Design a protein around this ligand. Structure first.
Ligand SMILES: *Cc1ccc([N+](=O)[O-])c(N2CCC[C@H](OC)C2)c1
Ligand SMILES: *Cc1ccc([N+](=O)[O-])c(N2CCC[C@H](OC)C2)c1
Lengths: 232, 9, 232, 9
């Protein structure tokens, strides 16, 4: 595409430079160009793709929430401007989510055979459908929610068969699926049950880990505990 | 509450 | 232009919403559209224009400094990528500075007759030439520096004739011109002299101010003092 | 050193 004339390795190098420079839109464009070269992504390259788009869509979500709050307050006649601008931000956010989903569907997921890559991409698919669900209201809010759930469920099924309960991708998948249950699917009890079971099963497997792996796993376990403290 | 922050490689 | 179909008042309203949402690129595009309506800007609208572009160019400058530092370190063969990406950021930064300068030249400065508006715009002109000077190396670095100096000098001459020594625009002009002297023009003694004289003349005029004006002026005086502490 | 921060209206 737009990055079609740049070498794959140069796109990856520039994505790392863009991360250092906090230029996340650039980072995401470089990583989109790298994916579109058609080769599978290494573990590090998958992380670059996820960091880039998470930062882009995170800024959009924060802006959408500010604007949605102002719009809800307004409903003196403020004119159409708050709604128009919230809609503009919403459409941009939806476009980024559709771009990420399109990369996953063409063709990252279908070529991902190892558990670490397939779970990673299916978790991303659940996440970006979840961000679509956050702004959805029309006749597809239900279908968007089901698409998020289905992606997270397939990732969970693979992760429980193929990864130890302390694996950081397995833990982060469970964390985010529990947030889906709490915030999107109106299932707080399922959120709490999943977070508790995930935490307890990880605790019981920590004895198998090196010092560095222990640090990685316990960091995500603390996020599960932080949510449980907020929810109970 | 909080999902994976995920904003730093 | 691109915002030509939107009402002036709606552009101003959306610039304020974009500020709240921390969407500074949008904010700058809305304020460019407002300027291009051709009417003069009020004090509040001038501040919106300056905040929007300061945030946009501030992100670019921070990224350029990160990339320039990496490039200087590299000079193992890292390939052309660090230089290419620094150049891309630099060109974007130059484009934003040229856009702001173009608004000032067509036609904000020529229509600005009151001291508060004319000093404000000439200070902006000095600032954006100063940001161009920060990245300049070729046969125009000298001419860019002189353009910054000339804009700041005209603003200083008006400010000393038309504004009290505590006026916040006068103070911020002097602060930024002192930074120009220290960082761009290799004139640290002129920087220190200007900051000291500005501070002392403001101190002697504080007795004339209300509580709220005193707070506004002393905030900028503290920035002059912070620079003097760093420079001496 | 520091110019006017200028990033908040
Ligand atoms: C979804 C997920 C689960 C775990 C981890 N992790 O172990 O850090 C991550 N990230 C968080 C940011 C740093 C890495 O970049 C993607 C890995 C994600
Ligand atoms: C150039 C300048 C001088 C003074 C002030 N001030 O008094 O605050 C300002 N700004 C700083 C940010 C807030 C306002 O937006 C432009 C005014 C600028």
């Amino acid at each position: 595409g737009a990055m079609g004339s740049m070498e794959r390795a140069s796109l990856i190098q520039k994505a790392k430079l863009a991360e250092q420079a906090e230029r996340y839109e650039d980072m995401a464009a470089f990583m989109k160009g790298a994916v579109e070269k058609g080769e599978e992504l290494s573990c590090e390259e998958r992380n670059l793709l996820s960091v880039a788009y998470k930062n882009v869509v995170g800024g959009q979500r924060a802006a959408w929430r500010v604007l949605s709050s102002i719009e809800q307050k307004s409903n003196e006649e403020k004119g159409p401007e708050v709604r128009e601008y919230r809609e503009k931000v919403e459409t941009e956010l939806q476009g980024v989510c559709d771009t990420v989903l399109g990369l996953l569907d063409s063709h990252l997921i279908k070529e991902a055979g190892d558990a670490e890559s397939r779970v990673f991409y299916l978790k991303m698919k659940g996440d970006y459908y979840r961000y679509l669900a956050e702004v959805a209201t029309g006749d597809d809010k239900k279908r968007i929610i089901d698409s998020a759930r289905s992606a997270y469920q397939e990732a969970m099924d693979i992760s429980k068969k193929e990864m130890p309960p302390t694996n950081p991708i397995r833990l982060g998948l469970a964390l985010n699926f529990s947030v889906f249950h709490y915030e999107i699917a109106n299932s707080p009890e399922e959120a709490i049950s999943l977070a508790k079971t995930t935490f307890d099963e990880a605790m019981a497997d920590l004895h198998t880990l090196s010092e560095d792996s222990y640090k990685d796993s316990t960091l995500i376990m603390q996020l599960l505990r932080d949510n449980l403290t907020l929810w109970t | 509450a909080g999902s994976i922050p995920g904003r730093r490689s």
